[PDB]
Design an enzyme around this catalytic site. Structure first.
Site, mmCIF file in Angstrom:
data_model
loop_
_atom_site.group_PDB
_atom_site.id
_atom_site.type_symbol
_atom_site.label_atom_id
_atom_site.label_comp_id
_atom_site.label_asym_id
_atom_site.label_seq_id
_atom_site.Cartn_x
_atom_site.Cartn_y
_atom_site.Cartn_z
ATOM 1 N N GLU A 198 0.869 -1.201 0.000
ATOM 2 C CA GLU A 198 0.000 0.000 0.000
ATOM 3 C C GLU A 198 0.896 1.239 0.000
ATOM 4 O O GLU A 198 1.805 1.344 0.807
ATOM 5 C CB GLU A 198 -0.905 -0.077 1.214
ATOM 6 C CG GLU A 198 -1.864 1.080 1.277
ATOM 7 C CD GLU A 198 -2.835 0.885 2.402
ATOM 8 O OE1 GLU A 198 -4.025 0.934 2.128
ATOM 9 O OE2 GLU A 198 -2.372 0.656 3.540
ATOM 10 N N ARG A 238 -4.659 -3.987 0.411
ATOM 11 C CA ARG A 238 -5.893 -3.159 0.302
ATOM 12 C C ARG A 238 -6.164 -2.881 -1.179
ATOM 13 O O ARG A 238 -5.471 -3.467 -2.003
ATOM 14 C CB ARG A 238 -5.784 -1.894 1.160
ATOM 15 C CG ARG A 238 -5.969 -2.153 2.646
ATOM 16 C CD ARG A 238 -6.570 -0.953 3.350
ATOM 17 N NE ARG A 238 -6.725 -1.133 4.784
ATOM 18 C CZ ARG A 238 -5.949 -0.584 5.714
ATOM 19 N NH1 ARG A 238 -4.917 0.187 5.379
ATOM 20 N NH2 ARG A 238 -6.220 -0.805 6.982
HETATM 21 C C1 LIG Z 1 -3.508 5.084 10.767
HETATM 22 C C2 LIG Z 1 -4.729 5.906 10.380
HETATM 23 C C3 LIG Z 1 -4.299 7.104 9.557
HETATM 24 N N1 LIG Z 1 -5.405 7.980 9.112
HETATM 25 C C4 LIG Z 1 -6.060 7.721 7.965
HETATM 26 N N2 LIG Z 1 -5.661 6.858 7.074
HETATM 27 C C5 LIG Z 1 -6.475 6.918 5.948
HETATM 28 C C6 LIG Z 1 -6.222 6.034 4.842
HETATM 29 N N3 LIG Z 1 -6.824 6.251 3.663
HETATM 30 C C7 LIG Z 1 -6.540 5.420 2.656
HETATM 31 N N4 LIG Z 1 -7.180 5.634 1.485
HETATM 32 C C8 LIG Z 1 -5.619 4.365 2.823
HETATM 33 C C9 LIG Z 1 -5.024 4.251 4.080
HETATM 34 N N5 LIG Z 1 -4.136 3.310 4.386
HETATM 35 N N6 LIG Z 1 -5.339 5.077 5.066
HETATM 36 C C10 LIG Z 1 -7.492 7.817 6.015
HETATM 37 S S1 LIG Z 1 -7.417 8.681 7.496
HETATM 38 C C11 LIG Z 1 -5.611 9.205 9.811
HETATM 39 C C12 LIG Z 1 -6.784 9.433 10.535
HETATM 40 C C13 LIG Z 1 -7.014 10.660 11.160
HETATM 41 C C14 LIG Z 1 -8.286 10.915 11.881
HETATM 42 C C15 LIG Z 1 -8.463 11.937 12.814
HETATM 43 C C16 LIG Z 1 -9.695 12.142 13.409
HETATM 44 C C17 LIG Z 1 -10.774 11.371 13.007
HETATM 45 C C18 LIG Z 1 -12.161 11.432 13.605
HETATM 46 C C19 LIG Z 1 -12.754 12.763 14.072
HETATM 47 N N7 LIG Z 1 -14.228 12.703 14.145
HETATM 48 C C20 LIG Z 1 -14.858 13.884 14.767
HETATM 49 C C21 LIG Z 1 -15.906 13.520 15.804
HETATM 50 N N8 LIG Z 1 -16.887 12.527 15.359
HETATM 51 C C22 LIG Z 1 -17.953 13.130 14.553
HETATM 52 C C23 LIG Z 1 -16.246 11.399 14.688
HETATM 53 C C24 LIG Z 1 -14.740 11.475 14.797
HETATM 54 N N9 LIG Z 1 -10.629 10.408 12.087
HETATM 55 C C25 LIG Z 1 -9.431 10.214 11.525
HETATM 56 C C26 LIG Z 1 -6.059 11.658 11.009
HETATM 57 C C27 LIG Z 1 -4.892 11.432 10.302
HETATM 58 C C28 LIG Z 1 -4.669 10.215 9.661
HETATM 59 C C29 LIG Z 1 -3.440 10.008 8.858
#
Ligand SMILES: CCCN(c1nc(-c2nc(N)cc(N)n2)cs1)c1cc(-c2ccc(CCN3CCN(C)CC3)nc2)ccc1C
Ligand SMILES: CCCN(c1nc(-c2nc(N)cc(N)n2)cs1)c1cc(-c2ccc(CCN3CCN(C)CC3)nc2)ccc1C
Ligand SMILES: O=c1ccn([C@@H]2O[C@H](COP(=O)(O)OP(=O)(O)O)[C@@H](O)[C@H]2O)c(=O)[nH]1
Ligand SMILES: O=c1ccn([C@@H]2O[C@H](COP(=O)(O)OP(=O)(O)O)[C@@H](O)[C@H]2O)c(=O)[nH]1
Ligand code: NA
Ligand code: NA
Lengths: 229, 229
Positions: free
Chosen positions: B35, B100
């Site tokens: 990936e 993936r």
């Molecule tokens: C290890 C995870 C890294 N990560 C992510 N990875 C991906 C991803 N996309 C692909 N196509 C392939 C792949 N391999 N990965 C998307 S995102 C991540 C998440 C947040 C974060 C921060 C905060 C939140 C949730 C906040 N919300 C607000 C409140 N409520 C309404 C629900 C929660 N979600 C994700 C940040 C950075 C990264 C890199």
């Protein structure tokens, strides 16, 4: 036969939409691909997305430039491909006139937005990488028609066209796009990442003078130009 | 012959990279496509862009989600295409294992980011439109292997793997991705815009138990699974 692909290039309000809608009527072998951005200015989901991102750009260009440029260029590629596979199948001398190209998307608009700090380096490098690759070999151009107008003519024509969003556009911005067009299509200083562009014939037409009722000389140059391709 | 295309799917730190690096060594007819996001975590311009956008996402996901998801999915398509045209040309039973797929990009990660309000509607609709079209017909999957782990196992494995950026990830987030995987690959409730996915065989492997030194039973299921394709 093989459809001839010709880009119509030029500054905002130079008269490309006017010129393209004159050409399309003059021959059954002549089709046009209107610019998606121009269409964005009942609704297809593209037009919903396009109007939203256009309005947001006027609010905050440094937030939306990357999103706009990627969507504008994807929408152009799909509309160009649809015309190339949907039209002129029974034409003897088929010609498809593109309102602007993937090259204006990058080397005029997206470039300027990077230079205006509306895209950071990562956004601009992701955009160029995406563009290089989204164009993996076909929309390659047989020729370019450059409708050359002064920034003042374009400013006057933005006034004539009367779009409310556009009335505040300064001459400085038009001057900047003008200089990019002059570099790319007249002096040919601008280096692209598309080798064959160096070779592509360019017809340059002065459209400072109103042509809506007096276009026969411009069309005669297009026909002579096309005969050489 | 025709390369068999198999996606390895599962939650963060379920063990997909571990499993894929076991498989690749077991047969000369077996290749892997790691990936791009996993690789982002000397430098190619992709890796420069990828690290920058990854770091920015940790700072401000509601600004960078669209940019990240588009670049993550483009980078996967090009890496999958390069393996499909660069490998297993002299294999009798060629298999390419994808870490993936374009489908996890959309229906797991990008979907969740929309649901977390990290993408607005326009961003999410532009993203789905771009995705629908960037997949214009080939990477179509012969099968999917679902490495199923509890959120607790994945949380423990994020701890085991020791990436500093990841140590703060809450169980709630892993639980959300878990539920999306269960909906898509086990209950098959999740409706995609890719008809043929409904038909694609899915092998589900429980990897709650450590397998690094005890994987022979998992591999026996993969070989039996592959024999049916
Ligand atoms: C290890 C995870 C890294 N990560 C992510 N990875 C991906 C991803 N996309 C692909 N196509 C392939 C792949 N391999 N990965 C998307 S995102 C991540 C998440 C947040 C974060 C921060 C905060 C939140 C949730 C906040 N919300 C607000 C409140 N409520 C309404 C629900 C929660 N979600 C994700 C940040 C950075 C990264 C890199
Ligand atoms: C009618 C023009 C609409 N417009 C744009 N159109 C495009 C465009 N891209 C395509 N691929 C195709 C196509 N047809 N059009 C890109 S942008 C616009 C500009 C600003 C704006 C706002 C402000 C600035 C300059 C600010 N800089 C800061 C100071 N200094 C360092 C330099 C100037 N530039 C452009 C906003 C919205 C739109 C829609
Ligand atoms: O010779 C011309 C060319 C254009 N226009 C007007 O100038 C404006 C901009 O033309 P167009 O929309 O075709 O420009 P584009 O942005 O497509 O280059 C419009 O109000 C046209 O009707 C004009 O009066 N005379
Ligand atoms: O059976 C396993 C599978 C994985 N791991 C560890 O769990 C973490 C996550 O594994 P991997 O990186 O392969 O997960 P992915 O995110 O690729 O699914 C790593 O520290 C692995 O070495 C483990 O100890 N036993
Ligand atoms: Na016509
Ligand atoms: Na191998």
């Amino acid at each position: 036969t093989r459809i001839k692909k010709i880009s119509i290039e030029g500054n905002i309000a130079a008269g490309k939409s006017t010129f393209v809608n004159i050409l399309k009527q003059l021959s059954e072998d002549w089709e046009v691909v209107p610019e998606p951005v121009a269409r964005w200015s009942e609704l297809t989901m593209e037009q919903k997305n396009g109007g939203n991102v256009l309005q947001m750009m006027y609010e905050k260009p440094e937030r939306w430039s990357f999103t706009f440029q990627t969507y504008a260029c994807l929408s152009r590629i799909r509309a160009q491909l649809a015309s190339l596979n949907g039209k002129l199948k029974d034409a003897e001398k088929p010609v498809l006139f593109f309102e602007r190209s993937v090259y204006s998307d990058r080397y005029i608009f997206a470039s300027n937005l990077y230079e205006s700090e509306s895209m950071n380096e990562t956004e601009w490098t992701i955009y160029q990488d995406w563009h290089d690759w989204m164009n993996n070999q076909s929309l390659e151009l047989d020729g370019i028609i450059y409708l050359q107008a002064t920034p003042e003519t374009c400013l006057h024509r933005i006034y004539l066209r009367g779009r409310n969003e556009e009335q505040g556009i300064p001459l400085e911005y038009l001057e900047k796009l003008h200089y990019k067009h002059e570099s790319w299509l007249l002096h040919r200083t601008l280096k692209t990442n598309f080798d064959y562009l160096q070779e592509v014939p360019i017809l340059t037409l002065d459209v400072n003078e109103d042509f809506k009722d007096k276009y026969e000389s411009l069309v005669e140059k297009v026909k002579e130009f096309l005969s050489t391709l």
